[PDB]
């Protein structure tokens, strides 16, 4: 009983369903000249393309 209750409570602090819901983002390669670096926020962190 202790192992379960403590496990449940512990996990209540790890990524919730909405957060784990992860998608993909499309980026057109015609908006970035040759040499440029564009940053796109994504899954919390910055996405470098």
């Amino acid at each position: 009983a202790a192992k379960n209750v403590v496990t449940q409570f512990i996990s209540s602090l790890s990524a919730s369903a909405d957060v784990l819901a992860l998608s993909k983002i499309e980026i057109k390669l015609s908006d970035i000249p040759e040499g440029k670096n564009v940053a796109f926020k994504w899954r919390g962190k910055p996405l470098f393309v």
Binding site: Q8, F9, S11, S12, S14, S16, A17, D18
Partner: protein
Amino acid sequence: APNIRKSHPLLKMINNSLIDLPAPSNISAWWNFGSLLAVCLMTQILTGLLLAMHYTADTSLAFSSVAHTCRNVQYGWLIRNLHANGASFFFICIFLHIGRGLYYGSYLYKETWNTGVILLLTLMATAFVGYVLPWGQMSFWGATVITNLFSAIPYIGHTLVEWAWGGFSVDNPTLTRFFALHFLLPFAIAGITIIHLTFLHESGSNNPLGISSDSDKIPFHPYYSFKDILGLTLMLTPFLTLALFSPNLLGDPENFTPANPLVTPPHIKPEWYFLFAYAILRSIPNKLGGVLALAASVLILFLIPFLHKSKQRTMTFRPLSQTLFWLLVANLLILTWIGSQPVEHPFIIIGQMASLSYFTILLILFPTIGTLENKMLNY
């Protein structure tokens, strides 16, 4: 000192309150609610923190942050059920603890008793501000009714209410401050519990026969540690059964609807543990009068120790008082029931009856019968 359990400045304290503590050999199940109340407190705090870590105190986000908790947080729904129902379990246990106290005249330990009442008052405030947080229709209006009670105070009344609100009505500043209070109060309860048990150890426990147990004491461990752990699991079954098989038996469906400042629910009814008091508040058709009756209905507890006329401590050997005692309990059931009904015949009259008898049993019959019983014993 030869053994650490006694010399160490910290263990010394654990030993003197949970290991070598002298306890009466004959205390019954009615002496189990003290520890159960302690566990509710630890349980409530622990589940409350876990909920607070996903809660958001803002009228535009309160309701949904709770929804977010129950729907997205791993075991969020479970933790919420345990918290919401734990509050009920807390009141069930506090009421039985109180009953035991009145029956066995535990109130003759005045300081333990008085702090006991402070604890009750504090638990009430806690439950109240906590109940308002989810911000449903019931949370909102209950918060409206309750806070407006204080407006009944003459002169300073309107001023205090608007102050407490942080504006002209229950609104966001009320919610944010209520969250803070709800977070803080439980810890005052924990602290005052220490004072409660500190006064108590000055004399140790009372017992069912109401006669000195110095001739027959036993170490708290393992007698009551084991008995207490047993009592824990016994009460833990209904709690979990309720929370896991009937999560919403005790709640008003109205609180599943976002608070609406413009529409008041048709039948505003408080949580079960406040019904009997609500009933009393309504018995007096006068605003201020009804508030005083409500205040007195709880503060009457500070008066109990002074209405003790019996030459005996408990009611164990007092058959007339025992009847008077169960009448009072039943009287409370009636009030509870009356508090859940609308203000209409026959309820209105039944209510005023029960209200009137409640105070009559405590202020007149109990001391009177106690004196009468003394004479029948030839004292």
